[PDB]
Design an enzyme around this catalytic site. Structure first.
Site: not given
Ligand SMILES: Cc1cc(C)cc(C(=O)N(CC(=O)NC2CCCCC2)Cc2ccc(C(=O)NO)cc2)c1
Ligand SMILES: [K+]
Ligand SMILES: [K+]
Ligand SMILES: [Zn+2]
Length: 356
Positions: A132, A170, A172, A263, A303
């Protein structure tokens, strides 16, 4: 054969104002402990961690962004609190800058060990994550873009135009990685991510399928966005079969970097998907058919501590040569997943003959 880098000094980066923040220091130690329980650690070649230099951070990041994050090393708690709120979803401690340096430098040593031939592939159990982070700002628990920096580092010690494939599974979108390489045809960025028409984090239409790269980079940015569904193994297998692997083979990368967030795994409080450890193992084994096996798996998100420990350990097992799991390729997909895959095929068919 397989390298592994882990350093408990990266546990020092922590959230002083919310000890229950899911980006926990124990993320990496739980993964490391699972490798010991499964007797995978002794089968790997331990690669030492090291600090990335400021000159190496400047391969992707502005001097101002490097300076600001570096300045947090000795800030008082009130200043660490104020600095963090200037970013989207960031907490900073006095050890955060060093841990970010250690995360990047650990992948530098891993990529170098692959490029010397000392190891065939490697895994990097590092934190904080990176995908990110932008050129000029930190975002979404990330300070510096570890995967992007490792790509540039690899090019800096082999060939400037070395073809590097970054696969980001991932859950995201790696907005930082996309932007850094958006105009670059030497680094192919392929991201699978939950999108929800732009409502899922990081809440930007940059993550949509029609963002294919800019200028010379047109065709070298593949966004695979998921909408309205609870995706799992069948959807990710189908995206690799129809999109990732055909494009990656035509690109013929010389190095494969995996931004490996877990995640998207079952039980993750931030992802909401149901990719199994066997699903991640299937994706890893598929990527090992590229770049003569030169694959570096870099930890990003994830997570659920039990889920990420099992998932990443299964990826290491694949890198060590263990037989890949069998998965039902005939399982029907969610209907919105077929729409997502067809939208990506339509957007990238003009750039890749393997899709025509
Ligand atoms: C500040 C904060 C802390 C925590 C623990 C979670 C979140 C969070 O709920 N977020 C996702 C999200 O939908 N936020 C919406 C945006 C629209 C308006 C209201 C909230 C942020 C986030 C950032 C990075 C990563 C990651 O790097 N995963 O690998 C995961 C989550 C915020
Ligand atoms: K992704
Ligand atoms: K690119
Ligand atoms: Zn994530």
């Amino acid at each position: 054969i397989t390298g592994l880098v882990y350093d408990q000094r990266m546990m020092l980066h922590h959230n002083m104002w919310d000890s229950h923040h899911p980006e926990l220091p124990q993320r990496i130690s739980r993964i490391f402990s699972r490798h010991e329980e499964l007797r995978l650690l002794s089968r790997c070649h331990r690669i030492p961690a090291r600090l990335a230099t400021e000159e190496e951070l400047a391969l992707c990041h502005s001097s101002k962004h490097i300076s600001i994050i570096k300045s947090s090393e000795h800030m008082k708690p009130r200043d660490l609190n104020r600095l963090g709120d200037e970013y989207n979803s960031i907490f900073i401690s006095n050890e955060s800058y060093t841990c970010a340096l250690l995360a990047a430098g650990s992948c530098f040593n891993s990529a170098q060990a692959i490029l010397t031939g000392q190891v065939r592939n490697a895994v990097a159990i590092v934190r904080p994550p990176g995908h990110h982070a932008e050129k000029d700002t930190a975002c979404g628990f990330c300070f510096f873009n570890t995967a992007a920096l490792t790509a540039r580092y690899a090019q800096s010690i082999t060939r400037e135009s070395l073809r590097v494939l970054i696969v980001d599974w991932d859950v995201h979108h790696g907005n930082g990685t996309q932007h850094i390489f958006e105009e670059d045809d030497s680094v192919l960025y392929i991201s699978l991510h939950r999108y929800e028409d732009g409502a899922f984090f990081p809440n930007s239409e940059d993550a949509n399928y029609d963002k294919v790269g800019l200028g010379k980079g047109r065709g070298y940015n593949v966004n695979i966005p998921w909408n309205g569904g609870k995706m799992g193994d069948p959807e990710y297998m189908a995206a690799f079969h129809h999109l990732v692997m055909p494009i990656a083979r035509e690109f013929a990368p010389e190095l494969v970097l995996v931004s490996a967030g877990f995640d998207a795994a079952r039980g993750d409080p931030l992802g909401g998907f149901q990719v199994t450890p066997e699903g991640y193992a299937h994706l890893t084994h598929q990527l090992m058919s590229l770049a003569a096996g030169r694959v570096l798996i870099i930890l990003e998100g994830g997570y659920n501590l039990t889920s990420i420990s099992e998932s990443m350990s299964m990826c290491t097992s694949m890198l060590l040569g263990d037989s890949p799991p069998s998965l039902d390729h005939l399982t029907p997909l969610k209907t919105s997943a077929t729409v997502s895959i067809n939208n990506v095929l339509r957007a990238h068919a003009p750039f890749w003959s393997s899709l025509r």
